[PDB]
Structure 1
Amino acid sequence: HWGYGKHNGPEHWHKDFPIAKGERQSPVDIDTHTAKYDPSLKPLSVSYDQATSLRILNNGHSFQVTFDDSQDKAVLKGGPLDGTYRLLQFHFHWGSLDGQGSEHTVDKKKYAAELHLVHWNTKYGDVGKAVQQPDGLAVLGIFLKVGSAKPGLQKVVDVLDSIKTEGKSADFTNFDPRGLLPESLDYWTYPGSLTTPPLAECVTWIVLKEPISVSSEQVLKFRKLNFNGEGEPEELMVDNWRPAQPLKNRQIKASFK
């Protein structure tokens, strides 16, 4: 199956998922001098006060915290979006060393990791139908750099030892994703895709300008996860990022001057 290794990594994905060479693939490099300020872009609306986390799970390509999305309890609206998008899950991509790990880049700069908060457009009823629409998902992307610790991440990192291998999950209730957001909600936006198979071209990307800082100890715990399942040859879950893809006929818009 697909992965991030030598013989199944991102350069191979197009054989099973030909849209990998498509016209609106993600991630991309954000050239800050080429992105144009759009004064018509509204402030983002992050409404997470009633978010209900359910589970945390190692899925073989990342770890994910899942939320109750059967009601409008944690929604994203405004910004470049038309309508209400419900939070389904968040997950991260990270590197083997601090100078790589993000999927999006900024003037070719790679960050140590990237957080993706995944939401789907309520006008399509369920996430599976949303992934078949060009405006079906909205992913909020947040860069992580290594420095001071992010206190609101510690509850996540402390439970990772209980989901070390592919397939494992645990109860993860009462987690507040507001503790992972930076001060500013200034952002770049462009039309793109899922960054893992099936690479569906269904995402409005909203990438925050301001990174969050996490400690070397916190990211070290990400790097102790395993791609493999319990009992198979241990392969550390590191470098689970797709590189930047061709921008093609797309403009990146900025919400800020």
Structure 2
Amino acid sequence: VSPACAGRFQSPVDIRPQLAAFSPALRPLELLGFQLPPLPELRLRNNGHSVQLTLPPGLEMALGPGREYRALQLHLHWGAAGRPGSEHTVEGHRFPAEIHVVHLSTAFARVDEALGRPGGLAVLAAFLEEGPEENSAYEQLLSRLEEIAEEGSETQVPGLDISALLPSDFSRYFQYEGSLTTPPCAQGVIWTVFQQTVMLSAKQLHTLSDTLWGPGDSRLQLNFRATQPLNGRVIEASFP
């Protein structure tokens, strides 16, 4: 219903590691200023599409020499009972959930200038899987989904280490150019997808996919977009 969602270079995509092109040029992700103090607080919001944390100024990220970004927000994608809800897949496998940290190039002053422009926005993405332990970092956010279950509801939460939400090795990722996965589906987004996953307890994953309400009288669930063709794009890998 936005023609942009029918462009040729959309996200998400199915990742095929063996077909990823290794390039030495893809150096380790640099994330500075992500260890936020408890004050000030941050806005967490149920928009009926996802849960969205607004991030402060000062979160700086580089994809390479002279290619720098500042973090804007983070949100999540998830499924339902017995059904996975990641956006990206790996060899056809859909993981339980998926975190997206959205950034704006320092070469643009406004997001509306950056939409549609090559490298204007960059998203860091990581897969969330079931493990045995309870995740501390994720609990800070999952604990407050109760408060904001309505739709439009919002709360304030204490500062947290945003970088603790992400996987172990910042030198191991896949990378491609695609689009926003929501309308306006703008192209020129650089997607970086960690090779390693983060682990949540089955308790936490049930919570995430069963606490929030979306449009009208309906649970917010399966908020991922279908897989989109690569159409000739080659996914790059930072490791052989």
Q: Taking structure 1 as the reference length, what is the TM-score of the superposition?
A: 0.86
- The offset of 1:53, in angstroms, is 5.6
* Structure with more of its chain in strand, by fraction: 2
Correspondence for 2:213: 226
Alpha carbons 1:190, 1:251 under 8 Å: kept: yes
Q: Residues 111 and 125 (structure 1 numbering): CA distance in 2 closer, same or farther, change over 3 Å?
A: same
SS in 2 for 1:163: coil
Distance verdict in 2 for CA 1:82–1:166, change over 3 Å: farther
- Is 1:115 aligned with 2:122? no
CA root-mean-square deviation: 1.6
Cα distance in 1 between the residues matched to 2:231 and 2:116 = 21
Alpha-carbon separation, structure 2, partners of 1:59 and 1:128: 20
Partner Cα separation in structure 1 for residue 226 and residue 41 of structure 2: 30
User: How far is 1:99 from its partner?
Assistant: 4.7
Deviations 1:137-188 (A, max 9, x none): 1100000011132211111011111111221111123122122111112100
RCO higher in 1 or 2 (8 Å CA, sep ≥ 6)? 2
**Alpha-carbon distance change, 98 to 180 in structure 1, aligned in 2, over 3 angstroms:** farther
For 1:136-147, list aligned pairs within 5 A. 136-147=120-131
Q: Would the aligned equivalents of 2:102 and 2:124 in 1 still touch at CA under 8 Å?
A: yes
1:17 corresponds to 2:2: yes
Q: Which runs of 5+ in 2 are unaligned?
A: none
Say whether the 8 Å CA contact 1:65–1:172 is kept in structure 2.
no
Counterparts of 1:82 and 1:190, CA distance in 2: 18
Structure 1 unaligned regions, length at least 5: 1-15
Distance apart, 1:222 and its partner CA: 1.3
Is the contact between residue 58 and residue 168 of structure 1 (CA under 8 Å) also seen in structure 2?
A: yes
Once residues 55 and 157 of structure 2 are traced to their aligned partners in structure 1, the CA distance between those partners, rounded to angstroms, is: 9
SS in 1 for 2:164: helix
Question: What SS does structure 2 have at the residue aligned with 1:25?
Answer: coil
Deviating beyond 2 angstroms after TM superposition, the runs of 4 or more aligned structure 1 residues are 48-53
CA distance in 2, matches of 1:130, 1:158: 34
CA contact (8 A) 1:97 1:112 kept: no
Are the aligned partners of 1:27 and 1:104 in contact in 2 as well (CA < 8 Å)? yes
- Which of these residues, 186, 194, 216, is aligned with residue 208 of structure 1? 194
Matched residue type, 1:59: N
Q: Do structure 1's residue 65 and structure 2's residue 50 form an aligned pair?
A: no
TM-score by length of 2: 0.92
